[PDB]
Structure formats: structure tokens, C-alpha cells
Amino acid sequence: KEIPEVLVDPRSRRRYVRGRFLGKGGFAKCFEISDADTKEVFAGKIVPKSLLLKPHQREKMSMEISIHRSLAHQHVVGFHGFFEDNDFVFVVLELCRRRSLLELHKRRKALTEPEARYYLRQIVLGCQYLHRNRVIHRDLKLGNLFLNEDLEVKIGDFGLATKVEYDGERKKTLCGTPNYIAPEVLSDAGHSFEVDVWSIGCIMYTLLVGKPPFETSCLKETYLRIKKNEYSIPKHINPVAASLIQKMLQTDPTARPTINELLNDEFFTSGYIPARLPITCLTIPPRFSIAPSSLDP
Amino acid sequence: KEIPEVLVDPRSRRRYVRGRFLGKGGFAKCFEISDADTKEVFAGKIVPKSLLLKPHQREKMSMEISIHRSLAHQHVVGFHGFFEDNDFVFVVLELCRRRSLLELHKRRKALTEPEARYYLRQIVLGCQYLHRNRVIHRDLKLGNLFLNEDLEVKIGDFGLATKVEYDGERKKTLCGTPNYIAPEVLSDAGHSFEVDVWSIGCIMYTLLVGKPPFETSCLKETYLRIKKNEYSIPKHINPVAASLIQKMLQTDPTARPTINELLNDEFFTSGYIPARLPITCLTIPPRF
Ligand SMILES: CCN1C(=O)C(/C=N/c2ccnc(N(C)C3CCN(C)CC3)c2)=[SH]C/1=C(/C#N)C(=O)NCC(F)(F)F
Ligand SMILES: CCN1C(=O)C(/C=N/c2ccnc(N(C)C3CCN(C)CC3)c2)=[SH]C/1=C(/C#N)C(=O)NCC(F)(F)F
Ligand SMILES: [Cl-]
Description:
Number of strands of chain A: 10
Oligomer: homodimer
Radius of gyration of chain A: 20 Å
Subcellular location (chain A): Nucleus; Chromosome, Centromere, Kinetochore; Cytoplasm, Cytoskeleton, Microtubule organizing center, Centrosome; Cytoplasm, Cytoskeleton, Spindle
CATH topology of the largest domain in chain A: Transferase(Phosphotransferase), domain 1
Shape of chain A: globular
Strand order of the largest sheet of chain A: 1-2-3-4-6-5
CATH superfamily of the largest domain in chain A: Transferase(Phosphotransferase) domain 1
Largest interface: A-B, 15 and 17 residues
Binding site for ATP (chain A): 22-30, 45, 94, 141-144, 157
Strand content of chain A: 15-25%
Domain Protein kinase (chain A): 16-268
Distance between the termini of chain A: 57 Å
Bound molecules: ligand A1JCP, chloride ion
Organism (chain A): Homo sapiens (Human)
Family (chain A): Belongs to the protein kinase superfamily. Ser/Thr protein kinase family. CDC5/Polo subfamily.
CATH architecture of the largest domain in chain A: Orthogonal Bundle
Order of helices and strands of chain A: EEEEHEEHHEEEEHHHHHH
């Protein structure tokens, strides 16, 4: 079933011209799209209804839209609306012209500590906004941490996200497999907000070390390592960073920092955070003083 | 830890007394040092191994030394040897007692055309030697164009330099951000020898105009201007100089002069090149 060259909203009468193909994942494909009248450019997520027949997939797509449309934050992908033809669901999102932390990681490998700190602070602020609105994302990974023109982080892909109905509620059901499986998800013990802190721990490790903490060549060994909390931080990682990784990557979810305590860690409060990163940082390491000072042009 | 007052080579048994502090950049500090027996004076580059733990920094330091120690040219900083303690790497270099073209530019701003020509010829001869030995410097800037007692140019800081392994190899990986970002570096398209001609174009512009070609108050606008080749040569620049700048500052690396063609431009062949510059030219415009 071919995807229309022009997307028409049956209700609001708005129409979009399908531009550049941006990427695909699971049931979904994503394109650059532009309004006819305003000429404003967005990201168009496009899902065939042929893949939404299995009732677990209908509820997945439904839940993503329900959660995402309720969110508005500087560090969360803007949600502009959704509509549907007889063959497709169309979701209009904020375009992020600098791809994702996944492409950055593939190109650069290990970032400098100030770059890691710059991105992680924004990831933490976004997740703090989610948790305050009782949303667990449950699938934070480099691939759904998008970058706009100015290299601001935008959290997207709410496909596994869930709303906590009361503070204290633990969930078991997932409609898919998260990239970073927290130990309480692997063990099916019930999970809450702490799974997001686990994934941010995995992300922090990956950005600073240049490889994932647990991932091996085979899933059996990966999952045994997560179960037994078997990972190693290289000697070259600065003690304060190493310390914060150890706090987040603990088997006991209750021993992990809350998202509010994460933001207040010595890593963030006492580490150099650049106000901006130059665009060259997508491809080449920037240069920083041993201890930078705001008392210098 | 603290830096030793005397530097001892464990192998060659040579020993150096740490003199005046000359300057620092990134992980490195530089001092004036003197031999015990000859009393010959050198520049001592001194890097803590504490900063070389990250394996990308170890290989950076390693590659700089590997490339630099293979070079010997009158317009390249002399490399006299290296050794290491348990806490430090020590590199013994040719001393350049008159700092760099950066300090000259800050004091003088726009140079006279014959001064610009004098420095650029030496920069081009140095780079011609590098390219012939399959070395791309990739970070030529006023700050690593050092001046000796006689204001002869010495190219140093091979920290971003790479050796071309085979004919038509294009490079992508840089272990740092060059001062002058060539458009093929910004776009991550792959680069070779032509990035050095781009940087020499930017240097020529800066020396003659007194400001950099692309640099603005915000890096976003600077990088958009490099991408779109947006720069302006003031009317007061002599046409032959203006023409040579335009040849070097082209988006297409293949459209730029090679380092060998650079030397043969009318700018060099038909312009007055002083045999030497008097020491006053560090602070006041000379008479010609
Ligand atoms: C947040 C909205 N969003 C974007 O803004 C995206 C933009 N990605 C970019 C940005 C700039 N360039 C590229 N390219 C790959 C270019 C292709 C042409 N080429 C010559 C240069 C690169 C891709 S992807 C996206 C998604 C979302 N949500 C999303 O991919 N979601 C997962 C899915 F699709 F599986 F559902
Ligand atoms: C080529 C060898 N070499 C020198 O010969 C250098 C000599 N610089 C001079 C000559 C004469 N006077 C002065 N000063 C006036 C001083 C400036 C500062 N200030 C506080 C005291 C005095 C500094 S610096 C150098 C370097 C090299 N290589 C180098 O700076 N490399 C980059 C680095 F270090 F960051 F790694
Ligand atoms: Cl992992």
C-alpha cells in the first residue's frame, strides 16, 4: 500500500507535502513534511493500519499518542497533532534537523566529559518533566534522544511509555522490549520511575566510555550481566562521573537516585557545563581548558 | 605532581635545567630548557601522563611525536628528541625566541604587503616540505607559526597532523577542532592536502586585512559563512593578493592551488620579497 505524496487532514483541512525520508523503526516510517499555506516544516511519523490490526499494536500506537499529545517541554519532542487515512495514521512532530545521540555516538565514540555533561543535563531535565507528570518513558536510548539545529536534546518515541495512576504504582506489562532492560524488567518484579534512571545510567556510561556497559555479542550473556550487575568502568573515567554511574546502575531500584537527586549530583553542580556546543562537535572533539572560567571571553 | 627542576634522559644520559615558562595549550606546558654540557638552549614541551590516560589522548601525543620526529626543514620547528618520567612526557624542540605570528598580528593588525609576502613564502615552503613527505598539518594558524631570533617562520604543533598512507587516501577522523575549519572538514566529506591550502588562504587574509575572513561574534554564523563561502575582501587589498586569496578560499578542494602552484602565483613571482625583516617589525610598520 503506497504512502500518499500529499497528506490531507480530513477535519482541520490542513495538507502536507511528504519530503525527505528521515528514518524508520518498528511499524513506523518518518519523513520531513511541509504545510501548504504556512510552508512550516515538521517531522511526519507514518504507520500503516495493516500493522495496527494486532490489538497489542493498536493500544501501543494509541498510548504513544495519548501520552505524547499531553506533553510540552523544551527537552521533549513537540507534538503538533495527528490524523488518519483508511490505510495510515499520521503524527506531526517537531523536526530535529541534527538526527540523534545514536548518530553522534557512532561518529565520535567516547565524548569529552563536558559534552557528556551538556547532553545528560538536558536528558535529565526532560525526564524530570516526564516523572513530575507521572510518565515513565521506559525506552530511553541514544536513538530517541533527538538533536535540533542548536544541539538541544528532545526526548521522543513514547511507544513503550506508561502513565502512573498513583504515586507508588508498579507496572509489569510492556508492549515491546526496551533497548536498556533494567534488572527489575528482566526479573518481571514490577517497575516504576527508576527504570528511566537505569537507562540514563547506561546512556551516561556509553557517552563517556564509547561502548555500552552490559551489551555483548549475545543477548544471553548481556541479560546474565544485567541480572548480576556485572559491568566495569575504565580507570580513565573521572571519579565523580564513575561514582554517579555506580549510583544509577544498581540492581535495587530503591538505591538509585530519583530524577531530582540525579540533577543535583556533584557531576552536574561542580562539573563544567558548556552553555552551547559548536556544530563541529557532531564530527570532531571540541577543546576545553583544564578548568574553564566564566571570567574569560 | 610538580614538574622536575632538572629533566634527565634515562637512555642518552643528557640532562636539562627547566628555565622560563614560555606558554601552554591543551594538556601541554612549554618551558625554556638548557643542556648541562653544551649549555645549548631549547624549548621543552612537558605533558602530564595523568592527562594521557584517555586512550585518544595517548595516541594523539604518540602521533604528534611520530610525525614531528620524522621532519627536518628550516621552516619546521626542529625536533631534537623525546623521553619520559613516570608522571611526564618531555619533548625537546628548537627554541623560537620571538613567539608566534599570533602575537605579531595582535600588536600590528594588518601587515604591509611585502611583510605578508615574506611570512607566506616561508609558510608555503614549510608546507611544501610537509606535503612532499605525505604530512597534512590540518591546524595551521598564527599561534603555531613560530618566529626565531631573525623572524624566520617555524611551523610547529603537529597535534592534529596525519600521514597520508596511499595515493588518494581521504581522511575523516580529527582528534581535535582546527582553528580554521575547511568546508570539507565542516561537512565531514573527507579531506586531504587541500585543507592546508585553505588555512594558508585564511592566514593570508588575516595578515593583509587585519581580521579573519569568516569569524563573527557567534560560531553558528561563522560556520554558515564557511559552508556558503561567504566572505568579503576589502577594496584596499591589491588585486593580485585578492586574486590569490579567492583561489585558496574555494569550497571545492580540487579548485584550490596545490602547495606547489601556490609558490608560483604572481603574488610571489612578481611581488617584492624582503631577504630579512628588522626586529622593529614586531611592533611598527617597516619602511620600503
Ligand atoms: C523527533 C522527530 N524525528 C525527527 O525529527 C527525525 C529526523 N531525523 C533526521 C534528521 C536529519 N537528517 C536525517 N537523515 C537521516 C538525513 C537523510 C538524508 N541524508 C542526505 C542526510 C541525513 C534524519 S526522526 C524522528 C523520529 C521521531 N519521532 C523517528 O525517527 N522516530 C522513530 C520512528 F521513525 F521509527 F518512528
Ligand atoms: C616551538 C617551540 N615553542 C616555543 O619556542 C615557544 C616560545 N614562546 C615564547 C617565546 C618568547 N617569549 C615568550 N613569552 C614572552 C612568554 C609568553 C607567556 N608569558 C606568560 C611568559 C612569557 C614565549 S612556545 C612553543 C611551543 C611549541 N612547540 C608551544 O607553545 N606549543 C603549544 C603548547 F605549548 F601549548 F603546547
Ligand atoms: Cl548496555
